[PDB]
Amino acid sequence: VCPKDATRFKHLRKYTYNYEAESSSGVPGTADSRSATRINCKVELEVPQLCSFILKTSQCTLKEVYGFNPEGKALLKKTKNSEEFAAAMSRYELKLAIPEGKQVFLYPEKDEPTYILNIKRGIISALLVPPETEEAKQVLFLDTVYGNCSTHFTVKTRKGNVATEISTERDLGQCDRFKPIRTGISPLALIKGMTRPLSTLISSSQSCQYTLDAKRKHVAEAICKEQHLFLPFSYKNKYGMVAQVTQTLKLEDTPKINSRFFGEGTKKMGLAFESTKSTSPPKQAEAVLKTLQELKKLTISEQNIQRANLFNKLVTELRGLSDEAVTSLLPQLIEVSSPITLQALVQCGQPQCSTHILQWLKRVHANPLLIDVVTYLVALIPEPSAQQLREIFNMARDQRSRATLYALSHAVNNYHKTNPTGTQELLDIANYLMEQIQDDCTGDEDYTYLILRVIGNMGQTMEQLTPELKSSILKCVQSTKPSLMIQKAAIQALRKMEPKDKDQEVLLQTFLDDASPGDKRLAAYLMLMRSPSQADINKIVQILPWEQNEQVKNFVASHIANILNSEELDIQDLKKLVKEALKESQLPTVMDFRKFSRNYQLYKSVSLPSLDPASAKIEGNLIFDPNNYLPKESML
Amino acid sequence: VPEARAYLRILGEELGFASLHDLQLLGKLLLMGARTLQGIPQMIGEVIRKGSKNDFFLHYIFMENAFELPTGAGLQLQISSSGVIAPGAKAGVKLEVANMQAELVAKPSVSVEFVTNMGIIIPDFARSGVQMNTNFFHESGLEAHVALKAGKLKFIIPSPKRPVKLLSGGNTLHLVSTTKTEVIPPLIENRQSWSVCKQVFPGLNYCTSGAYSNASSTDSASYYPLTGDTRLELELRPTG
């Protein structure tokens, strides 16, 4: 829908505008002294179809006031980036279509940068012209980059039924986005929620001056100005701070074009605003270093006057910085300083500083117990990030201790529950554990056992990504090269690996094996009961009166008696299969409990009012040998 | 050799284990901790004999509030304010062995700093802001140097050649551009800069100074405590 009232343009036209804006920050009292910047751009509005807008701009030159002139004038010059700034819009073309003249929707291409996006949005908001109405007061909800705003409409000069000079005036305190954006805050400053009176301490409003023509409804001239006033900490609430933003648009040419086509990109974007991080060139961070050099000088200079200032400005620039650059430069900060690094890290309200605490620890070469303690205490922090995963991977590989690896398992579990997307880092860790396990599962005993336990923790992600580790663990299971502890670790690994059919087959193979050790077979039997099949259960039933180690047979018989004894949901489901398997077989009578392995169980079901009956299950495994008097193995 | 080990699982996930090998690790780490401890007193004796300096400066945030809002053209109107204390101290007494020469320094200092930062950011590109700035710094430390040579003692008290000051409220504004940090120079009209000194000691003079610009009648400009790098300070000037 393209209403004719909002037809502030002409189809098949190329309006060539010059956008020049001056931003000045400072005070009028001190000879109007203020930092001033000039931006210029050549905009080529391309309107072949009503409500179809095509935008190519270039010639975007920016200059800055570095010196002034005694007559009050100033001096501008190019920077090192305005050229690269040109590269921003020398490449990008914009298409957009706006239904009824308020559904602002754009078609970005090749992931146009957020700052470029918002600058284009500001340009469009400057370019938005309301539909004609014969009413000197027309206030309504108008969408801008700053949100839905209650903007009025008063025509200063109207020729007949067509307005010529229009002043679009509005007050900035009325839009949706009046809340201060949640920015990086030092957690150590306990001042909270005091922002409301300060927002009251802020005044600002906008007025645009538009010149139209009753020939093609084209805009000849546009003059827009924003004026903020900061009230407090001056006197008589009038000599406070003032901020002016002035932009102008001159129509230069409008050649006729001929193109009956409007393209649209893959993105259908509104006139909202997206999160944008304080970004800065890394090069200036180098001055940061010489800045710390100043500190190095200052202590010999014995001057403390201007120190907190640089501290805050530097951490400010920091919060203007990035992550990978900072992790690259941090060793320099370490080699030059350390208590200062402590100050900066502790006075940092950014996740990256906490991330880099880890390099701090590993570069001061602290005590292993302390680093493992901090490893745990940060391991419980939610919302894991790939970066944190990388540091913890590094320090795991460097220390290879217990608490570190436990933190690895738990943090990876947190991210797995958090982000379903499995990235390259998971693959890197999987490859590392492949090279840690080989295929025979040879190596140390405690170290490799811990390896087996942690992959037993991560088996779900292992299967979801890399079944080669599953092949390795299965071939180690069906191998006698390692010790019994390794075999038991392989058995306990399948806890949350959900053995469907092949692991069940392997367990049945290694259990019905008579040469398999008694403890190995007991573990295989105990874990085969997780989700067994009627065929497997039946076969085990017939093999039971023929297996060796009569203590194992008595343990199995006691276990089956315990299973058939209790009544619940899943245990009755298992008892169904047990009865389906107990057709042409019997079980030996259990005798003694002080010399043979024994299985004991207990269930407590309680009924809650208007809730589910809570069931508590207690298990006890007392493995005994005919030459022992005390429980050799007792897992509860 | 029998081997026994105990592990614990919460909700399936574990939290560690204990074994005889763990006990051996504990014994060896206790031994290594003792071996680290035993050499410490010699190291600290050596370092105090060599002499050094120690500094304790906690630039602790007591008030911070930061934020930014979008602009009509799509730029980053940044505004924040901060109040900080950095109550540090500089010490470190060097000892000269076989020279009996002691050099003593201990100068605690107190600094109340406050800033408001305002202005615009152009993300990844540039910036243009303004800085209201207030410092309140005080310090009190004593200098002495004791040397012993051929049974000829002496207590040497060096005088800081700068006017050791005690009271200072500094109020200054700055313009810090993308790659520059500049002070806003004071007005020269009605530039009232006065200093009153008292001869309290033949080597030190008790001075009070006030430097500002009397622009009260000037429009669009605040009063004498504002509108300039106002400097009202209390110092002690060495006579030289």
Side-chain angles (χ1 to χ4, degrees), chain A residues 450-462:
Chain A
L450 191 57
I451 301 292
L452 297 187
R453 276 184 170 253
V454 287
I455 297 147
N457 295 10
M458 321 325 278
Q460 67 286 12
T461 302
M462 182 278 288

Side-chain angles (χ1 to χ4, degrees), chain A residues 28-29 122 179 181 183 185-186 188 235-236 239 279 299 302 305 343 347 402 406 446 449 453 495, chain B residues 5 7 9 14 17 21 57 60-61 64 66-69 72 90 124 135 162 219-223 226:
Chain A
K179 64 90 176 179
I181 297 175
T183 51
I185 301 296
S186 182
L188 294 174
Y235 299 96
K236 310 304 177 60
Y239 295 149
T279 317
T299 175
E302 307 166 359
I305 297 95
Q343 297 287 337
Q347 302 298 341
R402 305 174 179 85
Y406 283 123
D446 295 332
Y449 179 71
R453 276 184 170 253
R495 53 194 56 158
Chain B
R5 190 268 303 165
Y7 68 101
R9 308 180 193 282
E14 319 173 10
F17 56 96
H21 304 174
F57 290 87
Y60 176 65
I61 192 70
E64 200 285 327
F67 63 90
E68 173 272 335
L69 277 298
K90 184 170 185 177
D124 202 6
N135 185 332
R162 42 184 176 266
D219 202 9
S220 176
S222 178
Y223 293 156
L226 305 195

